[PDB]
Each structure stands twice: as C-alpha cells, then as structure tokens.
C-alpha cells in the first residue's frame, strides 16, 4: 500500500481525483463537526449527500488506478473497461440524485417548511475549484467525463440552493423554490444523457460510432483484394476509449496468397483505427 | 392493450409472473402510502426495496424482449448484452437507495410514532413468504438476482416486524440492517455482471483453457500461440480469438479445423483463429 500512494501521485487524473477527494473529506470533517455541535438539523443530511459525492469521486479514482493494471489470465484485455464502467456508474448516479432533487422539490411543493447558509457558499467555492481542476472533461475519458458531470451537478445544486435562498430573504417569493429544483434536475439529466448513451453503447458490444461510418469502405477495400471471395461475421466493438477490437472471417480462393491477404486486411483496418484485428482466412473448395 | 388482457389467460406460467409483479407493485404502493401517512422508515425502506424488485422483474422482461431482437450494422452482436446490463443496473439502483436509507437512519439517529395500523408488517411477511415459495424452484442473470432480492425482502420484512413490535427508537438500527442485507444480497449478481462487462475470461471456461492451449500447441506445424482473448457475450455464449504462428508450409486448413474443434468442445460458440505463417 506504500507503493500504491506513489502510483496515485504519478498519474495526472489519479492525483487530481485524490486531491479533490481529500479536500471533500476535509470539508466533510469540518461540516460534521459543525453538525455534532447540535446544528445538525439539515447539516447531517448535507453531510451524507456529500459523503455520497465522495463515494463517486472514490469510484472514479479507483477506476483510474485499476485501469492501468497489467493484464492477466482472468482479464485477457486488462482492466481498461473499469474506465467505461465508471462512466456508466457515475452517470447512473447522477440520474438517481436528480430524481431525489426532483423529489426534494415535491417536499417543498405541497407544504414547504421554512427549515446560516454559509456551508452552501464554501461548497460552491469547492465546486468552482473542482470544475477548474477537471476542465479536461469536455484510458481516462469516461472517468473524467463522469467526474466533471458530477462536479457540474453539485455546482448546479449549489446555484439552485443559493438562488432559492436569495429569493427567500431579500425578495420573498416563495413560489420560485420548487421550480428551481425541477428545472435543475431536468438540466442534470440532459447533461448526463450523452455519457450514458456512449457507455451503454460500449458495454452493449456495439460498433464504435467513430468506426461505424468508415466500415463499409473498409469492407469494400477488403473485397477488392485479389483472391478474396467474400466477407462475413465482421464484429467491431469498443474495448476502452479510442481502442477498437475487430474480428472477421474471409473466404478466399483455394490457392490465394494468404500472407498478402492478411497483411492487406490488417493495413486496411489499421488505417481505420482498429487496434486489435483478428482475420480468419478460410480457403474455399473451388 | 386488450390483446394482452386475454393472452395471459391462455398461458399459466406467464399468468403467475403477472400475478407476482402485480402483487409486488400493489403492495409497494400500499407500503409507500402507509409510510407516508405514518413515520415508519423501515416500512418505507421495504417499500423502496420491493418497489425496485418489481422494477427488476419488469426490466428483466423488457431485456428479454429486447434481446429477442435482430442484429444490424450498429449492433453486430445483437441486443443480448441488455440482459446483463439490466441486472447490473438493478444492483446499482439497489445499492444507491439502500445506502441512502443508511443516511436517513443515522441522520434520524442523531436528531412521530403514529402507530395507527402497524400490523401490515405481518402482511408483508406473508406476501414475501408466498413470493419466495413461488420462486423457490437465457434467463440466468435476470431472475437469480430477483430471487436473492426477494429473500432479502423476506428478511427485511422480518426486521420491520421486529421494529414494529418494539415500537408497541429501534427504527434506525433495522434500517441500517436492511441496507447491509441488501448490499450483501446484491454482491454476487453485481460480481457476475461486472465480470461479464469487464471482458473477463468466462469462469466456466477458465480451468479448461490451459488444456485447450496445450492441445492446440500439439497440432502439427504450430509454432506458438499468441493473443488469446476469451469473453462472455451473454449467458453461455462465449467469444474467443487467438493468433497461431505456424510453419511456413503448414496445413492451414487442417490446423484451422482442429483449433475450431478443440475450442468448440470447450464451449466457445464464436471463435476467430488467425493463422500467420512464420518465415522460418
């Protein structure tokens, strides 16, 4: 475990996630202290919501650390899919909290109860320094995207709380409180839609969207090879971000040059961006 | 609409599944209503847990009907993975809420009895006992998780029975207890789904793969084996790829047929053997 901490600081994203998690946990200890000073009334709720956040950054950091592990017998492809899984979990996290924020609006829609706003401001400043840290979220693509979306959702929630509060005291419009929550849950769901679509596509063994538009041309170029009869059973999927795996079976002439066909097919799919290609070659009867 | 109303009358097992999900949803609505009227966090937690059990059954049916679909250019492998995904999603939605339940517990533990009719806990016990009795006996990772969750629901109903008879506060302890039980119930389904989604070598294929590699190496004119990748597409559907290096004059037709035989006997449905002739 002593060498684990050196590995965490070695990586850029891993160290950024570790620093953000530690800062969140220090803000956590300070918050929980102010709570156990009998002011816990909404404080402890905020404390466990933020602990859930800390769990989200912990999941992202663990995915980043695991993704660099060497492949083994059980995990032939390595642990790179832990990146994609993170982007699946984080998005699936942000929807869930969204609904609760939705539900929270209902809690102040029928009979809203009026139950010193400073902790929201420090949480906000935490959120601005976090989004400054994770500006890259525009294999660590799904991890950074999910973590940036989580930070954006928390920043939005702070904006909503602050806006509702400033209409509470200085302006006194009670109607505008639930609608902020409704709108902002809507906004975070629309924010997490694309990451979830890409993660679901990757995990469903779907053809990579970037590779999908250039695949018929590759099939045509493979068809034009001398001695190739037909193509079948072509399967292309995404292992991790920008890493594509492809498999295909060619029928060829009974006396075709298998070496040259293999080299040309691999070249054709290498210019297309396929990193791992398996071309089975079957000689025909005639 | 009306066709589905008469279709389930013709069959029996689908009618039993419909009764299962309908009673689950109805009693979930009932428990949510009573927990809103009262302040029984254990009752609300059981409502959420079962609510999500019923959604697990419904999403399993939806995943089966989607996995029935055909493959196309975008989805070359079909929509079978949805099955796995459904199970995975269930676990996530079973781990989030339960953890959040943890929250409400410990929160309440720091800083509204309303007994009214607290006897619905034994009704939930009877319903969960009926459910686990009915479910006591490709749909592997769709309903095994549901069976584990209904067992956890029976245990949670026993826990809320204990909480109610103690009420005549022991509610936060039973809340964190059911949260722990839900987590330990969803550990194995999540482990299986994570293993499949991480492109891991199929566990039923692991111990037979060294023998397959040794038998493939024994084939005449094979020099070495490279880049062996095996993974689970869906239940009992394995995909395997490997690159053979062979002699410059090796019988590639025979080696291909023998390698495919070796891996077909081991249960690999789809196999891709790339044969590379060596220079020497």
């Amino acid at each position, epitope marked *: 475990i002593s060498g684990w901490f050196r590995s965490i600081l070695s990586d850029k994203t891993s160290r950024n996630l570790f620093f953000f998690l530690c800062l969140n946990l220090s803000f956590a200890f300070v918050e929980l202290l102010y709570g156990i000073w009998s002011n816990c009334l909404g404080l402890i709720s905020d404390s466990f919501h933020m602990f859930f956040d800390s769990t989200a950054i912990l999941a992202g950091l663990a995915a980043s650390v695991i993704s660099k592990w060497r492949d083994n017998d059980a995990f032939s492809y390595g642990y790179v899919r832990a990146e994609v899984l993170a982007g699946f979990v984080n998005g699936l996290f942000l929807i869930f909290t969204a609904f609760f924020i939705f539900s929270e609006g209902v809690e102040r829609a029928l009979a809203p109860p009026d139950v010193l706003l400073l902790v929201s401001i420090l949480g906000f400043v935490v959120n601005l320094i976090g989004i400054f840290v994770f500006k890259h979220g525009g294999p660590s693509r799904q991890i950074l995207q999910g973590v940036f979306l989580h930070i954006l959702a928390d920043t939005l929630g702070s904006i909503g709380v602050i806006a509702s509060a400033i209409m509470m005291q200085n302006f006194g419009l009670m109607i505008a409180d639930p609608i902020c929550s409704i709108l902002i849950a809507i906004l975070i769901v629309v924010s997490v839609i694309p990451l979830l679509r890409e993660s679901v596509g990757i995990l469903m063994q779907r053809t990579p969207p970037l590779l999908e538009n250039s695949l018929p041309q590759c099939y045509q170029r493979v068809q034009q090879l001398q001695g190739v009869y037909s193509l079948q059973e072509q399967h292309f999927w995404t292992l991790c971000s920008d890493v594509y795996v492809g498999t295909l079976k060619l029928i060829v002439a009974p006396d075709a040059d298998a070496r040259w066909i293999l080299s040309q097919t691999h070249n054709i799919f290498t210019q297309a961006g396929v990193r791992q290609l398996y071309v089975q070659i079957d000689f025909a009867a005639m | 609409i009306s066709g589905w109303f008469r279709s389930i009358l013709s069959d029996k097992t689908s009618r039993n599944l419909f009764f299962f999900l309908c009673l689950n949803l109805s009693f979930a609505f009932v428990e949510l209503l009573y927990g809103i009227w009262s302040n029984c966090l254990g009752l609300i937690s059981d409502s959420f847990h079962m609510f999500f059990d019923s959604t697990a059954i419904l999403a399993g049916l939806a995943a089966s009907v989607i996995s029935k679909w055909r493959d196309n250019d975008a989805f070359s492998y079909g929509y079978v993975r949805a099955e796995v995904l459904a199970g995975f999603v269930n676990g996530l939605f079973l781990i989030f809420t339960a953890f959040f339940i943890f929250s409400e517990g410990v929160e309440r533990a720091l800083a509204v009895h309303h007994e009214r009719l607290l006897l619905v806990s034994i009704l939930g016990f009877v319903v969960n006992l009926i459910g686990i009795f009915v479910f006591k006996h490709p749909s592997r990772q769709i309903l095994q998780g549901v069976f584990l969750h209904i067992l956890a629901d029976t245990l949670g109903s026993i826990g809320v029975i204990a909480s109610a008879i103690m009420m005549q506060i022991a509610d936060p302890i039973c809340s964190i207890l059911i949260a722990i039980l839900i987590v330990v119930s969803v550990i194995p389904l999540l482990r299986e789904s994570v293993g499949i989604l991480m492109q891991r070598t199929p566990p039923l294929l692991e111990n037979s793969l060294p023998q397959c590699y040794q038998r493939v190496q*024994q084939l*005449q*004119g094979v020099y070495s084996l490279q880049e062996q990748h095996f993974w689970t597409l869906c239940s009992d559907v394995y995909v395997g790829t490997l690159k053979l290096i062979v002699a410059p*004059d090796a019988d590639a*037709r*025979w080696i291909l*047929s023998q390698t*495919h035989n070796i891996f077909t006997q081991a249960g690999v449905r789809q196999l891709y053997v790339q044969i590379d002739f060596a220079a020497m």
Partner: antibody
Amino acid sequence: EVQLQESGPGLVAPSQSLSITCTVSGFSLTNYAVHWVRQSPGKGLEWLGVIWSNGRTDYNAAFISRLSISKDNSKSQVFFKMNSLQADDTAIYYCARKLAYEGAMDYWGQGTSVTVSS
Amino acid sequence: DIVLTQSPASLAVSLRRRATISCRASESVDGYGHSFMHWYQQKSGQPPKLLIYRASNLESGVPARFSGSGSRTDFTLTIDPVEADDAATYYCQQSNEDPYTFGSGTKLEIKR
C-alpha cells in the same frame, strides 16, 4: 530437380542403433518439413515422424521413446536415429518432403533397406 | 489411430476400362468441408508417388485419368481409362489425426 537421397547401414545388429542421413536438393530445409516413413511387407506403410523448419519434431506415439530426428540447414541434411532395433524393424525407410500446405508427401527418396539380423 | 481399410485387396481391370479403389476410414477425416485424405501410387521397386491430396485434388503433373471423390469416411480413387502403366499398388493416407496412417494397399492388375 527436387531430390532426397538417404544413406544408412543396410545391416544393423539387433538392439543396436540405426542412423540414416537424408540429403536434400532442389529445396531448402528452412521452409519445408521432412517426414520419415517406413514400409515393410508385414505392417505396410508406417509413418515415423516429421521435422519442421524451426526444428520442431513430431513422432509417431509408438516410437516416442526410441526415435530422434534432427537436421542441419547448412548442408541440407536430416538425421534419423532409432534405438532398440528389433526383428520387425527391417523395412525400407524413406525421407519424404511434405506437400506444402497439405498433409501429403509430394516427393520421396528412393529409400534405404534396413535389415536387422545377427 | 484412424484405421484405413482398402477394398478390394486386389483388382483386375482390362485396357481402357475403369478401375475403382475404395478406402474406408474408422473415424471421419473431414474438417469443415475438407477431407484430409490422399492417394499414392507405388510401382515395382519405386517410392510411393502422390496422386491425390485432400481426396479430390490432382497433384500437379499426374495424368488426368486419375480422379478422387468422397467425404467423411468413404473415399474412391478412379482410373479411367486404365493404362498399362497403371499396374501398381495404390494406398490411401489420412492426415486428419496424429499419427498419419496409410491404407493396406490395393494392387491393380492389368488384364489383356
């Protein structure tokens, strides 16, 4: 011009060793496998083994304990050594070039008769 | 191993007729549309000469009067028309399994 010529002792004492050198011409040992096959009036044609271009050797399982095939590409020679020669080992031994990308033997040597007697 | 039985043991055919030699395999020597069965001819005091490979393919340079057919476990070598040079022993060899095994042999006798 593809040619294989075997040279070995016609007479071998029982329980001794037999050594045949097959010289090849017209093709390289660096891209062709060479099979060893014996023919006797009793057991007919029997496949003994094959040596591959990288030096991999495959043997008939009935001879795994007493057979060894080696080669050298520089002089284009294949060496066939059998041990514990018995009374039924008297046969005509051929080194045959494998047919490329097939399981057959496209070219054969003239063979050497080996008689195991005292 | 795979046992190959050749029937008949001896065959007598006249000039310009058809000769049929049959090889039976104990187990299938087929794989994915390829029958790994080969036919050799051995004349008087000569090494065996390959005639057919993969049960239907003529070796380059052998005459067109030779033909092969069959699949799974039944294989046929056909000589049509039969010449005087075709007096020899004909062998079937499978290469679908280790070890390679040869047939017992069928001696073709020329009738005149």
